[PDB]
Design a protein around this ligand. Structure first.
Ligand code: HEM
Length: 214
């Protein structure tokens, strides 16, 4: 449709259905996942979110992004720091992995935040709305599999405490995305950047898959 929110959904249906077939994501999705694979996923998210939130901060007051700036409701860095401290220990920052696929993703986020700010919404959409939608099933799959102890940590990332209702926040976020002012060309590039975002994720999984199995 003409609403950016609906245009994004429709345009990424293909790459999303594709992602549901990426081995690593297939296995996780079907209950196949280990502590080592999970840790890798979490490390990935950490690096991705640090770069994403760094660029959102740089462009928070710009009209190309301000409407979708929800620091309190969406920030994920702090939750990932908590989780990684549990998964990798007190010196997690010194030992977490930083792979080519992770760097590739981070590189585009910075390129976008510094030279093509008008496209940052596409990356925020792909990450936030997605993680917000995959949250429940994933944390549940994690619990029922990882056989965690009873320390109450490691899964903070899957809970957005500052969002009372995910479905209601989704409406609000879509509405803010649709309030953004953009020319037909920018709008087109935003859609294409979203596809690029999915691809970065899909190829990140293909790497985590290659890495896990040796
Ligand atoms: C591994 C398999 C995956 C499954 C089973 C899955 C499942 C879902 C589900 C059930 C929704 C439906 C939301 C609705 O009710 O409309 C959704 C939304 C979404 N997913 Fe995934 N997903 C997967 C992978 C991905 C990946 C790799 C990304 C990108 C990191 C992603 C990004 C999104 C986004 C952006 C939405 C928002 C849709 C909207 O515009 O409303 N998903 N996903």
């Amino acid at each position: 449709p003409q609403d950016l929110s609906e245009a994004l959904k429709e345009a990424t249906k293909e790459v999303h259905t594709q992602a549901e077939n990426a081995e690593f994501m297939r296995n996780f999705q079907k209950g196949q996942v280990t502590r080592d694979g999970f840790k890798l996923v979490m490390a990935s998210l950490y690096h991705i979110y640090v770069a994403l939130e760094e660029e959102i901060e740089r462009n928070k007051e710009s009209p190309v992004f301000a409407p979708v700036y929800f620091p309190e409701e969406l920030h994920r860095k702090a939750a990932l720091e908590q989780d990684l401290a549990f998964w990798y220990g007190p010196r997690w920052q010194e030992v977490i992995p930083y792979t080519p696929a992770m760097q590739r993703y981070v590189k585009r986020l910075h390129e976008v935040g510094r030279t093509e700010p008008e496209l940052l919404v596409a990356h925020a959409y792909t990450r936030y709305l997605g993680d917000l939608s995959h949250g429940q099933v994933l944390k549940k799959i994690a619990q029922k599999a990882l056989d965690l102890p009873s320390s109450g940590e490691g899964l903070a990332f899957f809970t957005f405490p500052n969002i009372a209702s995910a479905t209601k926040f989704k409406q609000l976020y879509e509405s803010r995305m649709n309030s953004l002012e953009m020319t037909p060309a920018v709008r087109q590039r935003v859609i294409e950047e979203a596809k690029t975002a999915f691809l970065l994720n899909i190829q990140l999984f293909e790497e985590l898959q290659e890495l896990l199995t040796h």
